[PDB]
Amino acid sequence: SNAGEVNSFSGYLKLTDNVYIKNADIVEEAKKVKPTVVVNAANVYLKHGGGVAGALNKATNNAMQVESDDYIATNGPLKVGGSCVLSGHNLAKHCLHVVGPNVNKGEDIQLLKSAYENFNQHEVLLAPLLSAGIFGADPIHSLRVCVDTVRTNVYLAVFDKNLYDKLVSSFLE
Numbered sequence: 001s002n003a004g005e006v007n008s009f010s011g012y013l014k015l016t017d018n019v020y021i022k023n024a025d026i027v028e029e030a031k032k033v034k035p036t037v038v039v040n041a042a043n044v045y046l047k048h049g050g051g052v053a054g055a056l057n058k059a060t061n062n063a064m065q066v067e068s069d070d071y072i073a074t075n076g077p078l079k080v081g082g083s084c085v086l087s088g089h090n091l092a093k094h095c096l097h098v099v100g101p102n103v104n105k106g107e108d109i110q111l112l113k114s115a116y117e118n119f120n121q122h123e124v125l126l127a128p129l130l131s132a133g134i135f136g137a138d139p140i141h142s143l144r145v146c147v148d149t150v151r152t153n154v155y156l157a158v159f160d161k162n163l164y165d166k167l168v169s170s171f172l173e
């Protein structure tokens with residue numbers, strides 16, 4: 001890897017005492033920062049074909065999917081709102097696979113609070129906005145649940161510049 005120190009976050013905007021945000025690609029952030037923990041936007045079967053999960057898995061050259069398939073065959077699926085800790089491969093020491101509700105598929109948005117409570121077992125995390133994208137939840141709402149629920153230090157990477165700008169505007173109202 002590059003020779004930088006681990007957990008080297010740069011250029012984030014501090015929103016609260018423990019929540020930070022950056023307009024960035026989470027894969028490029030993982031490579032630059034070398035965090036202890038990267039959060040995956042997982043589904044219950046740990047099938048990483050799409051969304052953030054697909055980007056993370058591709059950046060591990062499919063090692064994340066191989067490990068996840070081995071895990072599920074023995075250990076069974078996660079629950080919505082739940083998490084597991086598997087290897088971070090080349091991206092991080094650990095990957096916290098967190099299942100936000102998929103409101104495009106009828107799941108209860110209330111489970112987003114449970115989803116973010118998984119972050120509180122880790123002192124500092126690189127993460128995407130939970131339940132965004134293929135999961136269908138309103139990103140402004142997801143940021144509010146994050147701020148209200150996470151107590152540990154979270155560094156959120158949002159790649160779409162227009163969505164970033166709307167999140168920051170929303171939060172500063």
Ligand SMILES: NC(=O)c1ccc(O)cc1
Nearest residue numbers: 006034035036091092093
């Ligand atoms: N990026 C990494 O692989 C890493 C290694 C050791 C740590 O204590 C934290 C992170």
